[PDB]
Symmetry: C5
């Protein structure tokens, strides 16, 4: 098997519409890159971050004995978790090529760099303790038995008007009026402040 073959098989046989269930365990980890437009009045922030998403799809696995361990695949050719930011107020602008990593064991990783507007608590952004903006990310349509989400300044721009004090992640499981099942989400708390 070479890359050409592996990609050919994936394209022919992966079922992008089909959740690779046996719940699918989805890792979500936000890597903040920039904070661009804070508004303390309206409580809205403009954030640039890598949405590192990781899950497993065994139907993509291959014998890597004399083959590559990894390939890059267009996400249009793969099933992808339907993650959404609940408190996003703009649709996600994907800044990067929409390719994922598929490892021979069936491990998939997709890490787009996203610019997005959020509605969150921006109060205290200009103080030393800073503001704490809470970002809620989960599967839009898959409940806890189908998709489970779990957590996992390094790449933060030194040229931002803001710095990052702390990032904490917290997993929740919420029931909504529409549906009887529980949906999981990850709440990433971004504690940041305006530099001097």
């Amino acid at each position: 098997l070479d890359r050409a073959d592996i990609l050919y098989n994936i394209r022919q046989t992966s079922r992008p519409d089909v959740i690779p269930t046996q719940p699918v365990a989805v890792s979500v980890s936000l890597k903040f890159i920039n904070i661009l437009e804070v508004n303390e009045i309206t409580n809205e922030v403009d954030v640039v971050f890598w949405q590192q998403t990781t899950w497993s799809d065994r139907t993509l696995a291959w014998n890597s004995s004399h083959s590559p361990d990894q390939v890059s695949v267009p996400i249009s050719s793969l099933w992808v978790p339907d993650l959404a930011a609940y408190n996003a107020i703009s649709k996600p602008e994907v800044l990067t090529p929409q390719l994922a990593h598929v490892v021979s064991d069936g491990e998939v990783q997709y890490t787009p760099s996203i610019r997005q507007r959020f509605s969150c608590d921006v109060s205290g952004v200009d103080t030393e303790s800073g503001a704490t903006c809470r970002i809620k990310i989960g599967s839009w349509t898959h409940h806890s038995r189908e998709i489970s989400v779990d957590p996992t300044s390094e790449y933060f721009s030194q040229y931002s008007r803001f710095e990052i004090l702390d990032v904490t992640q917290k997993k929740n499981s919420v029931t909504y009026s529409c549906c009887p099942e529980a949906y999981e989400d990850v709440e990433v708390s971004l504690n940041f402040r305006k530099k001097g």
Copy 2:
């Protein structure tokens, strides 16, 4: 039947162009779940709203025997027929913020609940008083009349606490209107959003 099979059948056989009318109008439930109010302009009479447009209807052609099968799957709306709902007083096109997937239940019940950000032209007068403004949003089928599509109704439950606004009350009303172009009557739902500045 597993998911793979069900989704395969749906994709192969659903007819997204074809309204799944049975014997009668497809009965479409519409329920707006307000999430945020973002800009208000009392001069221009325009508001910017974020809301879940929970839409529910029935398509028997999608039904399957759920004996030893899943009760529910998630399907791309591009592979399903979807009611052609529009907000009559919208002045921007709907920005869909969420993955465009619907629920199909084994009985053929379909639910689609996108989160939408949209601008409306409505009555914003009194937004800064304590009785608040009452913005009326009109949603109905754009091209299907009452005998093809009928719409029916189903507050601060998911509304953001970080909005500069708060919701006093949400009331829903069903109407049936005849337009100059066409002899038949088209149904709509008018959702009245009563809100005020904090």
Copy 3:
């Protein structure tokens, strides 16, 4: 015939690229703007932001069907139909289509398409704040089809105009023209819709 069959036939056999001209005559296209809202007037720059239904009506017999025991009408995605290449000559933004892009096809082959459009125009905004109002003239015609392939004609009424606009409509008049352009020897038809409107209090 049921809906499924009719839609199937249309999808298989309609030729969206092919103007349904008959007997070497022109396709008669009705254009009627139903104004919904006026959003952003600028008397300095002479630009207005308008929301309107562009009710477009024409005939493709090749879509026609025996409606004896069949529906009289279906809704069809415009991507599956030939559509007149109408353009607003004095538009300065591309048309933002607000509504689902579906047309009516009636069993006789009559097609109607009525998108709600938001668009900016360059027009005469002078007098918008007076009692006689401004008169903005909107020019709509086929971009590439001349008078012998496409003819445009007017069809009526503040009927659907928003009561919550800062503006109110005094009068709407329509007037058909036939113009020759430098590029081409043939004449192209257009409709000029005159929107007479003014600011409210």
Copy 4:
């Protein structure tokens, strides 16, 4: 042959990826200015609306009791890869993207375009006006594959008015490539009305 047949043949057999070179393709470019929307004399940026009348020949589209002309989606035709070198926004096409194909194989495409340019806006408020120079040519085809050549509707409601339009053809060599690429420079001489 009727329209249906001609369009069917074009669709089946035209090769949109294939430049209709005959043993360069001669492309006519003629900007018909419709409107000038915004001008910043500080930033040297203008917002213009114009018809980009483009004309060329593709014999592989020619045909013999038939129509002399059809309207064809440009996605079904080969189209010159023209670009405005000093544009700073991508072109917003305002009009239906259809071209004229004439039975002899002459193709004309005239989209109405709104676009922002970086050019000399100095003097826009004087009597002699500013002169904004717009540079249009093939992005990827050199002079042997594509040659560009030069060849009223301006709105009376613009704040601006057009004094003169002059066109001039150039042939430039770029660092990347050994061949020369042709362009047309359209000089738009305009001023603010008083």
Copy 5:
């Protein structure tokens, strides 16, 4: 072989999804040709740049016998494999201003040079001084590591707009190889340092 045949083969047989690796990483040349600097903000540390992103690599599977054939064709990038380059410090998605066509030479040499407008996060301090600001732009493969894709640099103002509010003092390029937390391999990038300043009074 004529153009039609060569383009037909390419469309039929090129594998856009498949990196054209040849026993060794694909060698990708990156060279930014700055055209304009549009909107500097010294407070927010953001710049709006227009530049040609001249990208060059080799794909032997596209090669052909050019004996009685063209030496070069223009091919839609959707029919070719293209390096997944990204600007790490870009804060808007790249606006491609030009037709998305690449050159394929008969030897399999591919060149793609879109004109891009993009907003970057970088050091804008000193933009109004005589020594100027130095904005550092980091471009590399998003998903291919050093053994799959290697990036290499290839004057300054050759095509820079004389009508910009800015002038270019110097452009330097620097190749790096970085390991990220996610992955065990090293990813290459090029850092283009754009030294520019506000033009005087």
